[PDB]
Design a protein around this ligand. Structure first.
Ligand SMILES: Cc1cc2nc3c(=O)[nH]c(=O)nc-3n(C[C@H](O)[C@H](O)[C@H](O)COP(=O)(O)O)c2cc1C
Ligand SMILES: Cc1cc2nc3c(=O)[nH]c(=O)nc-3n(C[C@H](O)[C@H](O)[C@H](O)COP(=O)(O)O)c2cc1C
Ligand SMILES: [Mg+2]
Lengths: 215, 210
């Protein structure tokens, strides 16, 4: 029983796989829906972790709503977001590893901007028995926007903000019949290198998303 | 513009009978505002009306943040590292500080004092009917690597506070998660054990009228 708590085996030597598809510079996303969908109370009942997935990609509508749920602008006045953040600073940027490329989600313009023309799915650097899925979200902390915050609270603020955003994604997945699993076992430096992140950018959590496997 | 620390403010005496265990009505609702609606209305509120939350609303709020959504296995509404509770949720009420027990869906008196707005920082958040306090229990993380305990408890607490924010958006309540905490001072006020530390506090109530 305690054996589940043993630290996971590191995955050594993996390189980014070649991009599959057309690795477009910008992917424009459709406007997210505002009225309809499963009641919040229903989504809380069904909120769970999934580790085996079907490989079918999310339709563009679902990719859009997921990204908006996690990191989107919900108030035009001031660019308020669907999730909180310390001092209103955008401390977390959401990246998306798709088979066609690694993208950064831009909330103000609700689109994806190419960060790397490579498939960086399941590059957490640890064997946590989470299978291959259509996409991974990576919640990256931007230390450049945290310098007016007390240093000893930055990991708590980054992790809490990332947690809230990952929770919005979980709840969206539950509303839309999708599986999700947040993953904190990250070789942060290795993943930061694969993602071509700047020195002040640190991966905090990832989240593997897709339709749950058929059996 | 950066928040300043406030001096030693002592806790207020509890108002009421301070019952030792409060039974909460069983969580059974599956209806209410669509998730997308709650996401659209998710925001922080800092000025509140003082009217207490009815029992049913308090029960639902606690269940959203910390409750059992799967009876067999004790799976929770929020994720947790290794499926083990690393966060204990406390509720600071006028009548006393209570610990929410997810398995029995009830409140157990922790201290007969009013500990609302005991963060130790001046973040301009007004008095509200209650605070939720998310406590990292390091006693339940001794087999987890030290370097991950802060990230995992903070990410678990953030998800729980997020479920709470969303519930508040669905119910027309205001909420604000607060992370600027003098943790040691607040832990002392809460009578927490040495290996338990408040990491986030969340002030909740109806938004102020005038
Ligand atoms: C901060 C945090 C980090 C997590 N890290 C991982 C991880 O690295 N790998 C994994 O498979 N699951 C991870 N999980 C998921 C938990 O294992 C999962 O929440 C737990 O099994 C309970 O299942 P449930 O989400 O269905 O309630 C993490 C959860 C949290 C809150
Ligand atoms: C980790 C974290 C800690 C926070 N701490 C405080 C705090 O101590 N005091 C406060 O007034 N607000 C706090 N907030 C709330 C943010 O200031 C707020 O989310 C931000 O201003 C944007 O407003 P919004 O929540 O309406 O989107 C915190 C938010 C996060 C994510
Ligand atoms: Mg203990």
């Amino acid at each position: 029983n305690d054996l589940k708590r043993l630290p996971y085996e590191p995955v050594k030597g993996l390189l980014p796989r070649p991009a599959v598809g057309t690795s477009e510079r910008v992917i424009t996303l459709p406007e997210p829906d505002r009225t309809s969908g499963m009641p919040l109370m229903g989504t809380l009942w069904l909120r769970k972790s999934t580790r085996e997935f079907d490989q079918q990609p999310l339709p563009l509508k679902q990719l859009s709503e997921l990204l908006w749920a996690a990191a989107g602008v919900n108030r035009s006045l001031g660019g308020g977001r669907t999730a909180p953040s310390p001092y209103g600073e955008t401390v977390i940027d959401v990246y998306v590893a798709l088979p066609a490329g690694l993208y950064r989600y831009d909330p103000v313009h609700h689109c994806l901007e190419l960060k790397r023309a490579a498939d960086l799915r399941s590059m957490t650097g640890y064997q946590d028995f989470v299978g291959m899925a259509p996409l991974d979200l990576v919640f990256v902390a931007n230390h450049g926007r945290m310098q007016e915050m007390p240093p000893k609270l930055r990991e708590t603020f980054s992790a809490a903000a990332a947690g809230a955003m990952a929770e919005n994604a979980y709840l969206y997945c539950a509303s839309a019949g999708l599986g999700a699993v947040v993953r904190g076992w990250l070789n942060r430096r290795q993943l930061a290198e694969h993602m071509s992140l700047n020195e002040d950018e640190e991966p905090i959590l990832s989240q593997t998303i897709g339709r749950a496997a058929s059996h």
